[PDB]
Symmetry: C3
Subunit: 119 residues, 3 copies
Amino acid sequence: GNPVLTELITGQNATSNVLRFTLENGASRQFTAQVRAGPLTGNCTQTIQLESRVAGGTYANLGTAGVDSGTTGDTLFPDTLGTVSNSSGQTQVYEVRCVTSTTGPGTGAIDQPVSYVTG
Amino acid sequence: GNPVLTELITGQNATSNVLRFTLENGASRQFTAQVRAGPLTGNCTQTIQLESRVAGGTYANLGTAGVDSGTTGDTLFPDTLGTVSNSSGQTQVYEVRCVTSTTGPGTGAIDQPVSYVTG
Amino acid sequence: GNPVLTELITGQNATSNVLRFTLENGASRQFTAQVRAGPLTGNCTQTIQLESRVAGGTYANLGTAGVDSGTTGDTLFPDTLGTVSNSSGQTQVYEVRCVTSTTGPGTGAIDQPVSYVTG
């Protein structure tokens, strides 16, 4: 009975808490994430990227990152999806986190109730 | 499916760890809490109150606080109930915590195995 | 509704994070753990032992420890089981952790993806 895991995305340039879970051989698990920032004070491009690894490994990109650009007064709202898979021959523990980053001079306040990663 | 969450109540005048969870639009979730303190060194009135908010918002009282009072040699044991509801139109992350407070000069040791908030 | 909990075993001489959970009166819950270390640099006996307590109490051994021993080049892989039981008369919060220890001069690298405690 593996539970659903949920963590907040707390910033435009931030790394989420780690979502840690066992996964059986031949199983897969899907994670989604989204972050809402605005209104922007200026030009801003927000990227949201899930990362995953086997425990103690090296984090690597999981799924294609969501990206969104806008200017003063806009609200960015990218989202992303990615699925961890185990075909190693045995049960293993995996770790997933969510990294957000921006380019541009502008910033936007996080709409916290809808900015999170879950799966 | 979303897991049951549990945190300890560790003091007579304390705020517990946060129980954090998604809630779908139109869903509701019930939490209970209880704290056992004693034997008292003197007169004491112990209040236990759940609070809730959308993530990053303002905490508000959730449910009617439990109250229990006693004197030297008594053991207090109030409990309380509360239900979080999402009718915002979309899935949102919510936060629940438990606040305990006392009036009076007396204090009582926390009986940790039965002092917690869960839901 | 209680979720499965999982924490890493990160060393040959280490104590895991705590697994914390409510348990109803008359209920039982089983935990398993295992640790994989190698190749050994020398003689080594690896023990893996679950411990449990009522919340805030004193930890005591839970189940029969797993034991495995080897020589240079060997990979040790002990595992263990243990069952927490509540016959107190009421729901209580319990805490479980996993302790690894070795005797001998040898050491072995932890194979982290399969070294964990879960239940």
